Design a protein around this nucleic acid. Structure first.
Length: 793
DNA sequence: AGTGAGCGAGCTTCCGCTTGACTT
């Protein structure tokens, strides 16, 4: 009888472990990590902070020795474990079977400093057998796995706190760069460039409702569509030559409003024959059970939930004991879960809808770690979703309903059906051998679909015969080729998973991180990159390309495996990565000279002007169009010929609205934004000359000016009256101010001219150098020469 | 005696594990 102390990661797991292991057992939780590198200069411990150069938390010159400090929030949890350790016999470290949990075991060892024998308890599924077997057969700490966790923690540290300060001095302050986020942002930027270089092509489709009811009128209504016409096929959106114009034009034929509109009008009905009929039975295999990435994607598709929202719900379900661990990267179900899954389906849906052999899904993810089982309902027997409606919330129920269906459907039979593919041929009345086509699908055996819901896109039909006579409602609609869709929260995560980037505990947080730093804007349900993202990604692609390559994360994992099995030393690769060496793999940083040289030796050699200047296209005249970033808001800029200095080009600029997306900045919109007024409000165009009149605010007062096309004439100005306002003045009021110096006539006494204007002190007329005041703004236009002479003498 | 020019401090940031609870 030995009293053993057990330390797990999740507190709700600690309750279940303490239930399986009884009296002589004390199970407590650590709530994740207890130590980590100091995040800022404040977290650095007083002694080791003030003296050396520990901004990185890894004094690299001293053999990459990390600086671990205990979290102040967990500082009360660490002291709680030290007190319980002095009253037990042995210490079991029961962290997850991942390389992060192994480090947590080591960190608990180096912090508590146990003067007591220690053993390593590991387990995948959390059940009574799995934990009793694990507690009876412990293990030893894997130092090679712990050092592989420190290698990546320092790697993400050197990547982070050494490259992001380059962005500060070359893009904008407080920005960030990383191994995980910079690739996701590069993905969003690269996808946006695909839309910014995508040219659309317009085509016309012709829908038709086939009237085959004169054959067999045994409900029936069938719709069809045209496929080809003689040696020319109906061009669709599939001829974009990968987001361009078109390719292979001899096989297809483009359709416009008049060309396709003639085929629908050339034959309302026609004597057509069935050239081919072919039906075939199809199948559809079920989906693997839920891991974290697949749950976040299907919650967004079927429930319109967000990653941050989905995980908050699943946390409630897990902590209350309704599902298993939601942060998982494995689709494996435990033997108890499979027995619960097949019994639940056999009892409810029946024995016919189950599967003979238990279905195992072994499609592993790139550099997965397999520490937990798939997200599935808790308990040795699954509680039906209807048996939990009284306790669950609205969001809790819908999510548990989606999780329960996924687990059960993963063990049910395949779906068997049959599709219908019929082709219609013949000739046209105008003189063309047109050929139509219509495809349909019909389900037969549901199987797993009885608990799930386009594997069942249906288009019912009646009957037909090969070579039977059919008769042809007609409509010709036009379409344009659509650009490749942007990334959502789901489509981005599945993109990172295909690259081995991110972990179940970071998916929902990557979205929040790239948003809270201006790199991406969430336009409803799509991730739109900003111009800062184009500048940050544009910089990293040209000076740290190996760091932002999609294979870089896979190249790191292959290097951490040689440290996990014990073939390569921990410090060796970090030394080569940070300082260099001819032992590079392909085009690695070691073959480049090390990250330190790639940062300190490039600060002098980065052109922030070209980095913040993002050329989008060339205008109709061939001049390049840039997008300056950081210069007090993003705006357009281009170098045009200068009127005063010949040769030396002058830049014209146009402020860009913050709500404009990068793919919407077309050359047609660019020149229209250049013609917009600089800082004033535009009033209109004067028909007498053709100049645009605007109302600005200058050094003296609110005035009105014309613009000139780039004798040598000056721009005519005119200061508005006291009765006018800067935003209320019209083009009419302006056009009067532009000719305000009005010569009411010459005075015969002194030969001088009399002109009426308006100044600071209201309206006034001047008799050469003598000027008298007026009492009405409108009277400078109604003043006669006679009335002006009566007061001037 | 109140304001607050003009010069210009010291700071920013990386991945992953995982629940925390006070008083005014």
């Amino acid at each position: 009888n030995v009293r053993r102390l057990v330390i797990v990661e999740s507190p709700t797991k600690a309750r279940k472990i303490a239930g399986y292991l009884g009296s002589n057992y004390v199970v407590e939780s650590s709530r994740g990590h207890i130590r980590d590198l100091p995040r800022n200069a404040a977290d650095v411990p007083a002694k080791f902070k003030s003296e050396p150069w520990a901004r990185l938390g890894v004094n690299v010159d001293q053999n990459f020795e990390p600086l671990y400090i205990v979290s102040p929030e967990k500082k009360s949890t660490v002291t709680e474990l030290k007190g319980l350790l002095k009253d037990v016999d042995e210490l079991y470290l029961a962290t997850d079977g991942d390389r992060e949990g192994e480090a947590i075991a080591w960190h608990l060892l180096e912090t508590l400093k146990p003067r007591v024998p220690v053993k390593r308890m590991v387990f995948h599924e959390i059940t009574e057998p799995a934990i009793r077997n694990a507690a009876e057969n412990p293990r030893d700490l894997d130092i090679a796995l712990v050092d592989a966790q420190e290698t990546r923690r320092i790697l993400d540290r050197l990547y982070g706190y050494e490259v992001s300060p380059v962005l500060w001095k070359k893009v904008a302050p407080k920005l960030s760069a990383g191994r995980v986020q910079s690739v996701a942002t590069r993905i969003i930027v690269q996808r946006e460039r695909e839309r910014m270089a995508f040219h659309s092509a317009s085509y016309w489709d012709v829908t038709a409702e086939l009237d085959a009811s004169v054959s067999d009128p045994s409900p029936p209504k069938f719709t069809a569509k045209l496929n080809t016409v003689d040696g020319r096929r109906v061009a669709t959106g599939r001829d974009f030559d990968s987001l361009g114009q078109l390719k292979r034009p001899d096989e297809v034929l483009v359709l416009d409003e008049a060309s396709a509109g003639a085929l629908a009008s050339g034959l309302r009905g026609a004597q057509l024959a069935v050239t081919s009929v072919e039906q075939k039975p199809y199948t559809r295999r079920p989906y693997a059970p839920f891991m974290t990435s697949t749950l976040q994607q299907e919650a967004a598709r079927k429930l319109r939930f967000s990653s941050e929202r989905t995980m908050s719900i699943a946390q409630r379900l897990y902590e209350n004991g309704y599902i298993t661990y939601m942060r998982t990267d494995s689709t494996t179900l435990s033997e108890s879960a499979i027995n619960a899954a097949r019994t639940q389906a056999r009892q409810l849906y029946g024995e016919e809808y189950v599967h003979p052999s238990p279905r195992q899904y072994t499609r592993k993810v790139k550099n997965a770690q397999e520490a937990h089982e798939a997200i599935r309902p808790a308990g040795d027997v699954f509680q039906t979703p209807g048996q939990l409606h009284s306790a669950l919330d609205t969001d809790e129920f819908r999510l548990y309903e989606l999780i329960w269906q996924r687990t059960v459907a993963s063990q049910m039979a395949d779906a068997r059906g049959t599709t219908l593919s019929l082709r219609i041929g013949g000739s046209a009345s105008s003189g063309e051998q047109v050929v139509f086509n219509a495809s349909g699908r019909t389900i037969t055996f549901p199987g797993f679909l009885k608990a799930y819901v386009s594997d069942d896109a249906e288009s019912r039909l009646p009957n037909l015969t090969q070579g039977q006579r059919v008769d042809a409602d007609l409509s010709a609609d036009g379409h344009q080729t659509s650009p490749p869709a942007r990334y959502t929260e789901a489509s981005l995560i599945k993109a990172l998973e295909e690259l081995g980037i991110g972990r179940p505990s970071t998916y929902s947080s990557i979205i929040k991180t790239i948003q809270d730093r201006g790199y991406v804007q969430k336009k409803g349900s799509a991730l739109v990159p900003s111009w800062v993202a184009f500048a940050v990604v544009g910089l990293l692609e040209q000076h740290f390309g190996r760091l932002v390559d999609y294979d870089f994360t896979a190249a790191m994992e292959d290097e951490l495996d040689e440290i996990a099995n014990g073939q390569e030393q921990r410090t060796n690769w970090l030394n080569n990565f940070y300082f260099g060496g001819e032992h590079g793999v392909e085009g690695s940083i070691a073959r480049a000279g090390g990250l330190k040289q790639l940062v300190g030796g490039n600060l002098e050699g980065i052109d922030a002007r070209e980095v913040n200047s993002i050329k989008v296209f060339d205008d109709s005249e061939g001049r390049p169009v840039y997008v300056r970033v950081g210069r007090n808001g993003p705006y357009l800029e281009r170098m045009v010929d200068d009127p005063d200095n010949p040769g030396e080009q002058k830049p014209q600029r146009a402020n860009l609205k913050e709500d404009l997306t990068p793919d919407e900045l077309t050359p047609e919109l660019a020149e229209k934004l250049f013609a917009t007024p600089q800082e004033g409000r535009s009033l209109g165009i004067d028909p007498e000359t053709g100049h645009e009149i605007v109302a600005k605010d200058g050094r003296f007062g609110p005035y009105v000016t014309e613009v000139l096309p780039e004798t040598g004439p000056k721009p005519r100005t005119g200061s508005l009256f006291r009765s006018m306002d800067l935003e209320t003045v019209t083009l009419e009021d302006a056009l009067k101010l532009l000719s305000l110096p009005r010569v009411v006539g010459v005075d015969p006494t002194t030969n001088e001219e009399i002109t009426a204007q308006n100044g600071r002190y209201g309206p006034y007329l001047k008799r050469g150098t003598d000027s008298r005041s007026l009492a009405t703004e409108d009277q400078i236009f109604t003043i006669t020469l006679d009335e002006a002479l009566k007061i001037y003498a």
